[PDB]
Design a protein around this ligand. Structure first.
Ligand SMILES: CC(C)(O)c1ccc2c(c1)[nH]c1c(C(N)=O)ccc(-c3cccc(-n4cnc5ccccc5c4=O)c3F)c12
Ligand SMILES: CC(C)(O)c1ccc2c(c1)[nH]c1c(C(N)=O)ccc(-c3cccc(-n4cnc5ccccc5c4=O)c3F)c12
Lengths: 240, 258
């Protein structure tokens, strides 16, 4: 659980996010790790949920290795952000990326754990091109995420497994559009108002009819009519 | 430099550019503004934000004024002076020869100012010039192309690169200078005097570079007199050093009007 900082080396800077800088390093002189040096956070509240997060273990989830309490030590993902990877592929590889994320989300759904900010910017890519979900449940300890939010979140702040489903459909669109920003011609407030009245993302060029039916199923105005991640995974597996 | 988005209203869409949708709006409930949304992923934002400090201080009556930026949330916005007659190219296509020379003068005065501040436009063309309610032409989006992430816009061989407004040193070597803006200005004068024809119509982007490499140039528009053509043609010298400066061009334009 607790890692001693004397067992970490702080090498190349990888990038900057909401909580600060993330660096590449070595743990115990041998393992590649990403060290999130938190500047910005309700730390006491995070430290209590970190045990629950340590126990979330799935091959398509970026693994938390430990904490320095502050630093969050995680699995190193050599191809960085999915959004960067998509902007810098065969249709079969794009569906595999959706599958990877869906498997991670079906696991979080099975553990009653909400991501709360699912988007391609929170997905990472390893040296083998496997996509994994990162920063799950971290936003609770902190306008642009309006573009990944269903109407019940925008109007009522009602977060559930069905609000992560909506975000997942937008993520599938981000994958199939090769990293376009969703709702390119609308501001954050306009997105919010226009999706509540029926605006949905268009079908990307690279998405087949069956692929669009799966992402579109995520955007039902009624949360109860949206599928679950078990159903989405099954549908993705049937298409490939 | 920072504008709180609570002080902006985002009204009609004007069009779409390289970075995204441009909207008309109001600032502090009273001032007309253009709000240029920068789609996330389309710009090198950190480098733009540092040059915005320099762009705030570029102030001239024939330059579309930068009023501020909204960078605390994505997508970021660039707030500028509102130009009610929109694009010069649209204005030309929808005039006495004296008014055409006055439009060249307006642009030349803005460019003489950017030249005096060592600031390169990098994408001068009638599509980047705007027209206000009084018919005054102003230069917009100066220095913004340096922050575009799409290589199709940025490389001299790219499909969206402005080859038709570029001198040979830009096309061959990516050498931008005050003299590459001078070349673009001559093409802009031709766009004005031809009433908004696309330069080198019936030439693809790569056939245009070859035409330039053979020492060929845009023909004289029939609305252009001999003296007007000598001014635009002076901008297209194969040698950058032999091209005039904007002070000289302005002086020549002022002499032709007299
Ligand atoms: C070596 C490489 C490929 O340059 C790279 C780059 C970043 C990272 C990287 C490798 N590996 C990780 C890991 C990890 N666990 O290994 C965790 C977080 C980050 C990371 C940290 C901050 C910001 C982003 N970030 C966020 N949004 C973006 C939207 C568009 C384009 C890039 C980014 C973009 O790098 C990050 F990805 C990175
Ligand atoms: C109300 C009116 C006259 O319809 C109008 C229209 C556009 C604009 C406008 C007013 N005012 C501005 C301002 C500003 N600062 O006020 C800045 C940018 C744009 C603008 C934004 C995107 C694309 C173009 N654009 C680009 N190239 C063209 C080639 C041919 C014909 C039209 C266009 C053509 O509108 C734009 F002009 C506009």
């Amino acid at each position: 659980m607790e890692i001693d900082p004397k067992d970490l080396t702080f090498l190349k800077e990888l990038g900057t996010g909401q909580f600060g800088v993330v660096k590449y390093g070595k743990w115990r002189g041998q393992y590649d790790v990403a060290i999130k040096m938190i500047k910005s956070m309700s730390e006491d509240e995070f430290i209590e949920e970190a045990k629950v997060m340590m126990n979330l273990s799935h091959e398509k989830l970026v693994q938390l290795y430990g904490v320095c309490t502050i630093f969050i030590i995680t699995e190193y993902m050599a191809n960085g952000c999915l959004l960067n990877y998509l902007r810098e592929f065969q249709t079969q590889q794009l569906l595999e990326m959706c599958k990877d994320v869906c498997e991670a989300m079906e696991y979080l759904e099975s553990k009653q754990f909400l991501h709360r900010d699912l988007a391609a910017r929170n997905c990472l890519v390893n040296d083998q091109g496997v996509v994994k979900v990162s920063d799950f449940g971290l936003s609770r300890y902190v306008k642009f995420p309006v573009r990944w939010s269903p109407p019940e979140v925008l109007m009522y702040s009602k977060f559930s497994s069905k609000s992560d489903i909506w975000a997942f459909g937008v993520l599938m669109w981000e994958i199939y559009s090769l990293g376009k920003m969703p709702y390119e011609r609308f501001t954050n407030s306009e997105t919010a108002e226009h999706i509540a009245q029926g605006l949905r993302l268009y079908r990307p060029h690279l998405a087949s009819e069956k692929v669009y039916t799966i992402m579109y199923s995520c955007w039902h105005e009624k949360a109860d009519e949206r599928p679950t991640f078990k159903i989405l995974l099954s549908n993705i597996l049937d298409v490939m």
